[PDB]
Amino acid sequence: NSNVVTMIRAGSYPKVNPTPTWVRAIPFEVSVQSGIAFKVPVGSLFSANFRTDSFTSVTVMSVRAWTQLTPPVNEYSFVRLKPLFKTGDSTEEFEGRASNINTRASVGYRIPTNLRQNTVAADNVCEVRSNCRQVALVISCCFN
Amino acid sequence: NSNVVTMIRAGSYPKVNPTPTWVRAIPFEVSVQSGIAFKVPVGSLFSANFRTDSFTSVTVMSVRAWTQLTPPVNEYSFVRLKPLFKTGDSTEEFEGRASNINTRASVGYRIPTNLRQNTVAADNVCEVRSNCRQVALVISCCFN
Amino acid sequence: NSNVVTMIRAGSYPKVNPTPTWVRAIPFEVSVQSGIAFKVPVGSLFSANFRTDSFTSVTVMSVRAWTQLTPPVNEYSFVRLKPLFKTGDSTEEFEGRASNINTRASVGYRIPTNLRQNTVAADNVCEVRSNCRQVALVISCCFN
Amino acid sequence: NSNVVTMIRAGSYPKVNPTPTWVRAIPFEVSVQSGIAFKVPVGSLFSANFRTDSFTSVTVMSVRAWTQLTPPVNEYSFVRLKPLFKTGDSTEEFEGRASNINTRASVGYRIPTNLRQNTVAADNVCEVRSNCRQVALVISCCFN
Amino acid sequence: NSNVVTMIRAGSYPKVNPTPTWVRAIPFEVSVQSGIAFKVPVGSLFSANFRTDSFTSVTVMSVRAWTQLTPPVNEYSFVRLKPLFKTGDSTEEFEGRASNINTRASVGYRIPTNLRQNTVAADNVCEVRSNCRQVALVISCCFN
Amino acid sequence: NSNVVTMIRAGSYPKVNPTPTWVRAIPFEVSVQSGIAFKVPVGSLFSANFRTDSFTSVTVMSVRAWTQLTPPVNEYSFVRLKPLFKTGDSTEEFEGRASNINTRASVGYRIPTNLRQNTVAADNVCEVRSNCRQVALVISCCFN
Amino acid sequence: NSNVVTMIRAGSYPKVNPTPTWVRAIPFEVSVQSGIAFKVPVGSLFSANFRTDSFTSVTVMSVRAWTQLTPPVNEYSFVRLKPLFKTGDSTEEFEGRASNINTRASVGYRIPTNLRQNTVAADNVCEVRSNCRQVALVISCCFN
RNA sequence: AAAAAAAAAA
RNA sequence: AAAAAAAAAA
RNA sequence: AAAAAAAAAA
RNA sequence: AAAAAAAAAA
RNA sequence: AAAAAAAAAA
RNA sequence: AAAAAAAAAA
RNA sequence: AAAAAAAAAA
RNA sequence: AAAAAAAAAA
RNA sequence: AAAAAAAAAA
RNA sequence: AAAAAAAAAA
RNA sequence: AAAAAAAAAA
RNA sequence: AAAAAAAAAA
RNA sequence: AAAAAAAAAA
RNA sequence: AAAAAAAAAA
Ligand SMILES: [Mg+2]
Ligand SMILES: [Mg+2]
Ligand code: NA
Ligand code: NA
Ligand code: NA
Ligand code: NA
Ligand code: NA
Ligand code: NA
Ligand code: NA
Ligand code: NA
């Protein structure tokens, strides 16, 4: 290969876009209480911490969740996810449980193409339930 | 295809990175004076305007340039690029000229793999010369 | 095949969901007046009568309609459907007529993938018009 | 694919059924005492919690069980299942044990086709024994 | 081929629809100011001028834009499009520029299937920016 | 497929037409008297009710007719069509009869290419005769 | 194909015939009384109503008949045909009956080649019997 | 797709 | 499955 | 026979 | 990849 | 190995 | 998929 | 030689 | 014979 | 893809 | 059509 | 040449 | 390369 | 079926 | 032998 700078025979000025879309897997944590659903805000996906503070909308594709702290004494970890949508919330409670008390529980869900519209900060993605006090989410999404 | 949310059988917690790299084509303009080289600052590539203000380093791959305003009376536009590097500046002056007085001049250069290291805001990419008072750059680069 | 109970060598606790989705064809009737459109409520789809009272959202895929009582004297039955959507109602009036005075008129429409989002009880599916005083609907849908 | 509503050329009124059957995997927990068999009631399978309160009968295909709390000090978990049938109970004691003290024990059994009749709320499915104070069941069944 | 009228052996009365959908490419112009975004109203698509005044909804598929008057002295034309959506506006600024001062700038964007829902008159399609005082749009859409 | 907006690399301004042609099947009814031919006006094809009020001309391709009310006591329905043309009316009487007293009679005719010129509101399409007091027409045509 | 008038290189004067033969299916009705045979006159085939008044002879090929009004109360329609010939009448009584009280009875017969000679107005085709007061005939014939 | 009648054609 | 009209596309 | 949803399986 | 249940389809 | 997004290329 | 034990079978 | 039940196995 | 740099070419 | 100039190489 | 980056997948 | 919408058709 | 119009031709 | 003139076209 | 119109037909 070349070891020196070389000319490019540029043509006409191209189509450009200073502010493109970005497909991402975004990791963050939420706090969860015993017996109580936590509504996960879409606003958590927009942050300098993820290089996403310039976006104000996102299309979520899938949500995965893991318990992030240990469960109560004698118990195995569990985590549940209930999808939420502006056009009508679901009542599914997708659940994983650990089979070793020292191991994370995990579960996820995929949003079908027909429900992949945009969401903004004030929207919620899902409800999380767990016997652990924190849950770690990884959300696959398209910032736009 | 599915019209409903469906379960994902998530496993162990994955490797994650909240602050990934990003390959980009960044468009911006510089002002140019008659007979004078303008040193293009790398700092212009880091901006909320490009969603890149969270980066402090970038690896430039190629630089393309177009004249952005009309040339002086009786003249055809030209633009020249001289690559700059922290380990030693080049003396190449890659040049394009217009063949229609109403048309942009354009030129570019490719940086070879052996010279693709990082640059930071206080570094310069290249010198630009032109008979036009503004030049439009599109820089292909890897933010990291 | 086996005539006795046999062991299953179960492994780890599986992903579970006590409240799954359900794809359905739901039959119900609506009352219709001469010259007047009836807005069919989505709420009619959630009922112990269909085993669906535990759902609060549904994604409608298609709607079929039949006249359910006889037409006025000297007339053949007709039925019309006009699709309604939260993002903008249609002005199509899909229509079937009977060709025997003793026979039901029927028609349907399919909702395209891009318009398959959720609806809730307060939403409406379509407008129905007919010269018959009842219309029988079968709605293909995905409870979630 | 289509982006708009389209006509369906419906024919005669179809065979319909507002209250269909449903094949399911139903997850629930039972309490278990040291040295004592717990009889698992079929009635637990009919609940708003599983969207199954409209059913009166169910045909069980298989039963799987996991210990759901930790075992006594110094011990590995175990779980046993004894199938019960209205025409004559079994005396099999299908058993799984854990091989790591921190891990669930599990086991299951399949009901052969010749014994897949209906059961109702009054009936029992099986006896459960364990050294753990709760057992998690997942029962594969056909509600009808 | 036949030079005379011939009989058609018609059967039963067909499904009919007096008010069908229509796929279209709609051309219209908007006024644009220096430094200021113009929100393009969906209402502009419904007009006797396009034979579309009987519709009240439309599904937009793509948007293309051209500058429609000359640019300021010394400049090349440019046009930018920012997609807008009821579920969350984008922050993309898709841009084209002219490479001859006497030529139109152009650019477009495609709306993905998952974002193709209906819009009505009070909704907006996109924001337009330009250095030219008028922009000509051609919008590909499905009236329904 | 893409889940986000994407750029279109538009070129020059295309040929456009804000008022295109439209191929249609137009359903409407006419009143018919015993023993008397009804001249069907072309003007009935231009209406807001069909989204066609912006047109001044139409090219008719074929005409189909069904009786639309019941026949007199003891009789089977019949319908006849006689094609009319500005260059010379036909004397054909294409006829269908019902073979069940409760069923519609139907018939149609095709216009050959050599006779497919435009017609305007003032013109007539055909004469209709029937023993029923209304006839339902579906006219296949090209609005231009 | 050609869009203009073109010369034909005509030769000698051809054989001509101002008054050709014509193969036809002629529809007409006859009145019928209970228990009485109606002799169908060949003369009915020659009429301005069929464009056949310039003919004085016809060769009949086949005869089909349908009841044309409803039958008496409690009855199904029937129609019978007895072929008549100048060289000797038949005694066949070809018969059709309806299987739905609302439907026409129908039947026909074919005349063999050896019996296809001419008939004139004063000749009869066949005898018709029915329980209905009118019978519709369609006669396939060669006017000459 | 084959036949008959009127027409047109290589 | 072929054709026409409106659109989109390599 | 192919697709979707719930389940079951190599 | 095969089977069962609900649906949809050539 | 196939798909999507940003870039680059024959 | 092959073997052993109990059963059933062409 | 094929199936079922208990076991054993690549 | 293949690669890189400057040039030239279908 | 082929040739020339500088270089590098099996 | 091939490569790189972010994601998703058998 | 392939897809979508309206129509027409074997 | 195929079609139409005028001409010419085996 | 080939050529020329006017036109239309992939 | 192919097409059009009326008819008849598998
Ligand atoms: Mg009937
Ligand atoms: Mg371990
Ligand atoms: Na940022
Ligand atoms: Na930023
Ligand atoms: Na219920
Ligand atoms: Na209930
Ligand atoms: Na319920
Ligand atoms: Na109009
Ligand atoms: Na209109
Ligand atoms: Na006459």
mmCIF file of N, CA, C and O in Angstrom, chain C residues 46-71:
data_model
loop_
_atom_site.group_PDB
_atom_site.id
_atom_site.type_symbol
_atom_site.label_atom_id
_atom_site.label_comp_id
_atom_site.label_asym_id
_atom_site.label_seq_id
_atom_site.Cartn_x
_atom_site.Cartn_y
_atom_site.Cartn_z
ATOM 1 N N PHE C 46 -62.369 -6.350 23.674
ATOM 2 C CA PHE C 46 -61.939 -6.777 24.998
ATOM 3 C C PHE C 46 -63.162 -7.197 25.794
ATOM 4 O O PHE C 46 -63.997 -6.361 26.156
ATOM 5 N N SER C 47 -63.279 -8.493 26.023
ATOM 6 C CA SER C 47 -64.455 -9.037 26.710
ATOM 7 C C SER C 47 -64.192 -10.434 27.226
ATOM 8 O O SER C 47 -63.540 -11.256 26.560
ATOM 9 N N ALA C 48 -64.752 -10.748 28.396
ATOM 10 C CA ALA C 48 -64.761 -12.122 28.866
ATOM 11 C C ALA C 48 -65.398 -13.053 27.840
ATOM 12 O O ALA C 48 -65.057 -14.244 27.770
ATOM 13 N N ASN C 49 -66.303 -12.511 27.024
ATOM 14 C CA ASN C 49 -66.958 -13.300 25.969
ATOM 15 C C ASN C 49 -66.013 -13.845 24.911
ATOM 16 O O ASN C 49 -66.367 -14.755 24.170
ATOM 17 N N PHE C 50 -64.829 -13.240 24.814
ATOM 18 C CA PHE C 50 -63.808 -13.673 23.841
ATOM 19 C C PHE C 50 -62.537 -14.162 24.538
ATOM 20 O O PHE C 50 -61.548 -14.456 23.862
ATOM 21 N N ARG C 51 -62.591 -14.239 25.863
ATOM 22 C CA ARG C 51 -61.433 -14.562 26.698
ATOM 23 C C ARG C 51 -60.355 -13.490 26.598
ATOM 24 O O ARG C 51 -59.168 -13.809 26.794
ATOM 25 N N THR C 52 -60.736 -12.249 26.314
ATOM 26 C CA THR C 52 -59.767 -11.158 26.086
ATOM 27 C C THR C 52 -59.831 -10.001 27.074
ATOM 28 O O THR C 52 -59.210 -8.950 26.864
ATOM 29 N N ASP C 53 -60.562 -10.159 28.173
ATOM 30 C CA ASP C 53 -60.707 -9.055 29.120
ATOM 31 C C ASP C 53 -59.423 -8.686 29.868
ATOM 32 O O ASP C 53 -59.340 -7.611 30.431
ATOM 33 N N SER C 54 -58.407 -9.555 29.841
ATOM 34 C CA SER C 54 -57.117 -9.244 30.459
ATOM 35 C C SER C 54 -56.190 -8.385 29.601
ATOM 36 O O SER C 54 -55.135 -7.949 30.087
ATOM 37 N N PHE C 55 -56.556 -8.152 28.341
ATOM 38 C CA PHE C 55 -55.801 -7.266 27.469
ATOM 39 C C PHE C 55 -56.392 -5.861 27.501
ATOM 40 O O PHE C 55 -57.609 -5.691 27.646
ATOM 41 N N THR C 56 -55.547 -4.867 27.251
ATOM 42 C CA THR C 56 -56.017 -3.487 27.164
ATOM 43 C C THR C 56 -55.599 -2.848 25.837
ATOM 44 O O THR C 56 -56.038 -1.725 25.517
ATOM 45 N N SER C 57 -54.803 -3.580 25.041
ATOM 46 C CA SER C 57 -54.375 -3.133 23.693
ATOM 47 C C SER C 57 -54.518 -4.264 22.670
ATOM 48 O O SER C 57 -54.443 -5.446 22.993
ATOM 49 N N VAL C 58 -54.645 -3.886 21.410
ATOM 50 C CA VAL C 58 -54.748 -4.837 20.322
ATOM 51 C C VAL C 58 -54.213 -4.180 19.054
ATOM 52 O O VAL C 58 -54.316 -2.956 18.873
ATOM 53 N N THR C 59 -53.591 -4.983 18.209
ATOM 54 C CA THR C 59 -53.183 -4.545 16.880
ATOM 55 C C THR C 59 -54.061 -5.194 15.847
ATOM 56 O O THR C 59 -54.031 -6.405 15.672
ATOM 57 N N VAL C 60 -54.882 -4.377 15.176
ATOM 58 C CA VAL C 60 -55.810 -4.881 14.177
ATOM 59 C C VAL C 60 -55.107 -5.094 12.850
ATOM 60 O O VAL C 60 -54.363 -4.205 12.385
ATOM 61 N N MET C 61 -55.363 -6.249 12.221
ATOM 62 C CA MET C 61 -54.744 -6.613 10.934
ATOM 63 C C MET C 61 -55.719 -6.521 9.762
ATOM 64 O O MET C 61 -55.372 -6.080 8.680
ATOM 65 N N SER C 62 -56.939 -6.977 9.969
ATOM 66 C CA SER C 62 -57.959 -6.870 8.920
ATOM 67 C C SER C 62 -59.363 -6.873 9.527
ATOM 68 O O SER C 62 -59.566 -7.362 10.636
ATOM 69 N N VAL C 63 -60.318 -6.383 8.741
ATOM 70 C CA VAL C 63 -61.704 -6.256 9.169
ATOM 71 C C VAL C 63 -62.564 -6.787 8.050
ATOM 72 O O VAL C 63 -62.428 -6.359 6.904
ATOM 73 N N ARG C 64 -63.434 -7.737 8.370
ATOM 74 C CA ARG C 64 -64.441 -8.217 7.427
ATOM 75 C C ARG C 64 -65.832 -8.004 8.032
ATOM 76 O O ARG C 64 -66.010 -8.090 9.252
ATOM 77 N N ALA C 65 -66.808 -7.714 7.180
ATOM 78 C CA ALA C 65 -68.147 -7.373 7.597
ATOM 79 C C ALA C 65 -69.160 -8.036 6.692
ATOM 80 O O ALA C 65 -69.005 -8.083 5.452
ATOM 81 N N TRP C 66 -70.243 -8.477 7.330
ATOM 82 C CA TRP C 66 -71.397 -9.086 6.626
ATOM 83 C C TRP C 66 -72.654 -8.440 7.168
ATOM 84 O O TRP C 66 -72.808 -8.222 8.370
ATOM 85 N N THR C 67 -73.630 -8.202 6.304
ATOM 86 C CA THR C 67 -74.940 -7.844 6.852
ATOM 87 C C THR C 67 -75.510 -9.040 7.620
ATOM 88 O O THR C 67 -75.221 -10.207 7.300
ATOM 89 N N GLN C 68 -76.294 -8.732 8.654
ATOM 90 C CA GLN C 68 -76.672 -9.718 9.665
ATOM 91 C C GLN C 68 -78.203 -9.835 9.806
ATOM 92 O O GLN C 68 -78.716 -10.754 10.464
ATOM 93 N N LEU C 69 -78.927 -8.886 9.221
ATOM 94 C CA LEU C 69 -80.373 -8.978 9.119
ATOM 95 C C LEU C 69 -80.744 -8.682 7.678
ATOM 96 O O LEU C 69 -79.935 -8.166 6.900
ATOM 97 N N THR C 70 -81.998 -8.963 7.327
ATOM 98 C CA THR C 70 -82.472 -8.757 5.976
ATOM 99 C C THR C 70 -82.596 -7.270 5.608
ATOM 100 O O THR C 70 -82.736 -6.399 6.486
ATOM 101 N N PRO C 71 -82.545 -6.981 4.288
ATOM 102 C CA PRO C 71 -82.607 -5.592 3.830
ATOM 103 C C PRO C 71 -84.054 -5.099 3.738
ATOM 104 O O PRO C 71 -85.009 -5.882 3.923
#
